[PDB]
Ligand binder design. Structure first.
Ligand code: FAD
Ligand code: FAD
Ligand code: NZ1
Ligand code: NZ1
Ligand code: NZ1
Lengths: 587, 587
């Protein structure tokens, strides 16, 4: 119990001090360590409810039972007299840098999860390397340190969403008394992209500064795991070499898929290319119906573009389908065209005009599921048909790391792979939600367990989401159809209501488009199984409720909490119309 | 136990059926009542924990132990056969309408609490009257049904705040690529007031339709309680008469105070006048430092006004003072001027030009707390120095209703006054938070206890708030200073952090002005005592966390919950810097 924890903690910690807050000999050792600039984990036994047992177990390692005790990479170094001995004899620095491997930790992948893991590990004295390389897109697009979210994901996507939201702010301003004329105003794409990219550039720089300031080695090189402890690296001159590490974290993420049709790779683009594109896409086809497809089509339409979305089967597969349909109906009422039940079978009519900064022109041919034909011209074609890893590029098959049928890494609930010193975090961890805050939490918590004796695991259940379509959609927990499948229709009650933002009244916007519902379990005290909201600032609205759902909130907890007025979120505190009653949810 | 609940329910309900969902005899009685358009409460005994105990207890009133049993105003009326007998002989309508009083319920006051109480009561067959009258301001301002929030409070105040927020949307849009020039755009006060007043008028009418469709008698008349059951009314022609009622709900609210100085009533205005003012206020002095004072000064400055606030001592007395200082510092940096530690001693220079729609001109003279003098000219002077009831107008002292030293009604935890059939709700209920959703919950919950046999009480603790200053401030729970005073400094831990909205990056707004903190109790598992956030959309951010705080959230609950990215709210899920540590909170 305690003894198995202590043995795991001593074996993998890089530099660790066992201590008590009240001991002057411990304080004496602490003072020497960072005077020598030695980072290390510390465990204060007088703060743990079974530190008495832990203190006894230490003797199995050191032959002594007192504090302080200092260890390095699994070996007892000494008590207070001995550490100080090594200090004044100039032997300490070499003791703490002695290692079987080049690094205590090698992280393959410099994105959301890998940067978080690497920085946290270095805080506790682990000698750490972070490797990052960006394979160019088929047209040559590349970018800096930070991963998919920072460069070609959450950050530029929401900034362009905000640019689209501002179009309605300009419209609304007239009704609130401002003198501008919305009809005489236009949008400049390249001015937007320049501002977005300047912010991304400050993030690239900020990450390189942060790794420097934590004493992390950053290598802009491609990594490949060739045995449990050996990582082969290839740098920008094609020089190949091998570095070794005790623990390995795989954190290499995914890249967009292309469909296997003529012309797709040659003449289309993906989200990887869109966020730094030097010309306005113009008339655009988006192929796909994921949240990436709908978000990109949405802001393009708000920025003045002529936009079509070609949908294989349904919108937002895997999300609540009543909410998916309301999301799409709103988009279709504000500009976006949909080619439903349709797939592509791409021809080039004009080459991209790199000089004058203009798109080319394309003929797209496809068919509907009944066999009728699709044929139309577009200036830009964007594929948003899913994302995949390519771990046969990162991971030799002889190492023994097990993958699933989709090519993701099969892990235990502490992120361990089938190779005992190798872990995986982020989008490549099979079965986990593919989100930046999850990858960050998993990375930081894993670093603390490896190098500071922590025990807390990452909790992957009921993680809230937000889809940033022109009208935003936040959710936490089960869809209504999943809840019914799991418990049966008679054990599920659904409370719901339309609402109108107060900001929308003077602006003459729609009365009954925003919507929210709570999906509850009758036989478990009306437990809230899932929460759904369509409306402005849906992410801000949803976040706080995710804490209450984590704690097991019921309908009664929502009723006894009082609202804040005037807000959209307060509508969750007075819900009363049930779906079974058949009463209308309009307001 | 069960005995005394049943007695209370029978004596108080207007029309109540005791039933079981499975019984076809109950189904037949319900249908008769529905056809005769008789509204009633229903208690389904087969869905209560001790419904079997109630069923035998009903014998004390009816001499029968069976179901259905119908009661009217405390009298047993009959079982299925007997009720059908009265229906067949055309005797039912007179039985259900006969009462010792004109009304089952008279509500004095047609505002947030009063309208909610009256509509809820009528849903269970209580015969209800709602009285409302708006005594004009000193310059003659008056308005329609709905109360302070609807007409001169939360609704018009947040609509003008939105108009002010749009000035920053206009500035921001240039940086996101839109071609307007904020420099050549102006604001028209009267166009704004017209749109706001048109929405308020749709609410006045909506409340009159709602009362009609619930069979509630609405009298636009001044009401005065002269004995426990007698209400004297005065109408628009000064015709005086008396109506009687079984239960009485006092819900008359408050009005703004004026300071006792020359010129104040003659030449100043209050928030009561501001929201329909026919001319732009111009150079404005706001006297006071409550949330009303600051919210009004904030949007006036954003609309292009020259605004000064005169502060007697501190900003936002009663709120967290660190937070209040950050609110005031933001307004000072964005154009509001402050005259600190200063009170007024008002002179007319120009009379309001009612013809060409222009303000007058005033001289304000005052003095600072050390003795220096204040003297300066303003076009409009707005007093926001508090609000008070005047129950001497509403309530004869001989009736016996206890008031406190401030003139508010002293109530038990079920809103009962010292006169057993008289209740008080909303802003006049002493010691309760003076907020619109509180009044609505109190009113709806009380009507159900009186007329449908409900037992749930209103919970007044940890009610969340939002101050809609130009940068908004949301809170739920204790201020930091109140926590320290109640538990001691050694037992309080404070986690805090600055943040920057992603929307502010491309717009080049400030890096370290938004701010958030959690105030926690160490010896109670790091219980979250209070939550505070300064930033955009603060009310949307805070609302959901109020459910978690109601359920007893700890810091570990905030830590194990995952963030939604990119949002402002997610910063709460990863807080780690403590105030004790001395580490900077900047980003
Ligand atoms: C358009 C879009 C929008 C999104 N919006 C959101 C959103 O709003 N909110 C949200 O929570 N999530 C969002 N996501 C998801 C989010 O981007 C991912 O979940 C997150 O980036 C995953 O982090 P990661 O560390 O697992 O991988 P990544 O961030 O992809 O990092 C992996 C890194 O490793 C590098 N690498 C790969 N192979 C090697 C190798 N052999 N050697 C060295 N380096 C290598 C990659 O080039 C990359 O830099 C979005 C994704 C997309 C595509
Ligand atoms: C400027 C301002 C801004 C505010 N903003 C907010 C906000 O953002 N959020 C929030 O939660 N709260 C806000 N409030 C507070 C909110 O308005 C009040 O808490 C709420 O209106 C109180 O409701 P009530 O039912 O107690 O009284 P009221 O809403 O004031 O209604 C009482 C009614 O009774 C009438 N009456 C009085 N005497 C008699 C009589 N003798 N006979 C007949 N009728 C009579 C009055 O004229 C009035 O119409 C704000 C208040 C102000 C002043
Ligand atoms: C549609 O109305 C809007 C949209 C976006 C924004 S950003 C801001 N400050 N105000 C608004 C108002
Ligand atoms: C930094 O640029 C790089 C880094 C590593 C590699 S491995 C390869 N094949 N090309 C590159 C380019
Ligand atoms: C316009 O409606 C009214 C209603 C009641 C009264 S009592 C009074 N003094 N004036 C009025 C006006």
């Amino acid at each position: 119990g305690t003894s198995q924890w202590l043995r795991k903690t001593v074996d993998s910690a890089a530099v660790i001090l066992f201590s008590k807050t009240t001991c002057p000999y411990c304080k004496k050792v602490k003072d020497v360590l960072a005077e020598a600039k030695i980072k290390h984990a510390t465990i204060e036994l007088d703060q743990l409810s079974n530190g008495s047992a832990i203190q006894k177990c230490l003797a199995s390692f050191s032959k002594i039972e007192t504090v302080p005790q200092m260890f390095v990479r699994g070996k007892f170094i000494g008590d207070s007299q001995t550490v100080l001995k090594y200090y004044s004899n100039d032997e300490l620095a070499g003791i703490v840098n002695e290692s079987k491997y080049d690094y205590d930790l090698i992280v393959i992948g410099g994105g959301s999860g890998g940067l978080a893991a690497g920085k946290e590990a270095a805080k506790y004295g682990a000698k750490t390397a972070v490797l990052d390389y960006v394979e160019p897109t088929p047209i040559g697009t590349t970018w800096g340190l930070g991963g998919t979210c920072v460069n070609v994901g959450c950050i530029p996507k929401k900034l362009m969403h905000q640019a689209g939201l501002l179009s309605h702010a300009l419209e609304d301003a007239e009704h609130f008394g401002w003198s501008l004329d919305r009809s005489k105003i236009s949008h400049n794409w390249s001015t937007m992209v320049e501002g977005v990219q300047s912010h991304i550039g400050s993030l690239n720089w900020g990450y390189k500064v942060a790794l420097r300031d934590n004493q992390v080695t950053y290598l802009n090189a491609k990594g490949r795991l060739i045995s449990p402890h050996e990582v082969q690296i290839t740098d920008k001159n094609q020089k190949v070499s091998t570095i070794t590490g005790n623990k390995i974290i795989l954190a290499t993420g995914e890249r967009p898929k292309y469909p296997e049709i003529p012309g797709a790779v040659e003449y289309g683009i993906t989200s990887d290319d869109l966020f730094s594109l030097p010309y306005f896409p113009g008339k655009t086809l988006v192929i796909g119906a994921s949240y990436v497809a709908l978000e990109c089509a949405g802001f393009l339409a708000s920025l003045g573009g002529d936009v079509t979305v070609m949908v294989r089967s349904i919108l937002l597969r895997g999300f609540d389908q009543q909410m998916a349909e309301k999301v799409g109906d709103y988009m279709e009422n504000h500009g976006v065209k949909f080619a439903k039940l349709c797939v592509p079978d791409i021809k080039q009519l004009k080459v991209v005009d790199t000089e004058n900064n203009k798109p080319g022109l394309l003929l797209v041919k496809g068919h509907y599921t009944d066999g009728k034909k699709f044929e139309e011209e577009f200036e830009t074609v964007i594929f948003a048909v899913g994302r995949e890893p390519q771990l046969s590029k990162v991971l030799c098959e002889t190492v023994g790391v097990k993958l699933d049928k989709n090519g993701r890494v099969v892990c235990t609930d502490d992120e361990q792979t089938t190779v005992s010193n190798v872990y995986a975090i982020g989008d490549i961890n099979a079965g986990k939600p593919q989100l930046t805050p999850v990858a960050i939490q998993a990375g930081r918590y894993l670093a603390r367990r490896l190098f500071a004796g922590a025990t807390e695991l990452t909790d992957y259940s009921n993680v809230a989401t937000t889809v940033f379509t022109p009208l935003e959609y936040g959710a936490c927990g089960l869809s209504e159809e999943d809840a019914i499948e799991k418990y049966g229709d008679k054990d599920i009650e659904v409370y719901h209501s339309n609402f109108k933002p107060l900001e929308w009244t003077v602006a003459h916007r729609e009365d009954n488009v925003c919507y929210m519902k709570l999906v509850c379990r009758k036989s478990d005290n009306m437990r809230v199984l899932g929460l759904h909201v369509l409306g402005p600032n849906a992410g801000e609205i949803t976040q706080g409720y995710a804490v209450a759902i984590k704690m097991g909130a019921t309908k009664a907890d929502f009723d006894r909490t009082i609202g804040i007025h005037p807000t959209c979120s307060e509508t969750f505190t007075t819900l009363h119309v049930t779906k079974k009653s058949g009463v209308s949810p309009i307001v």
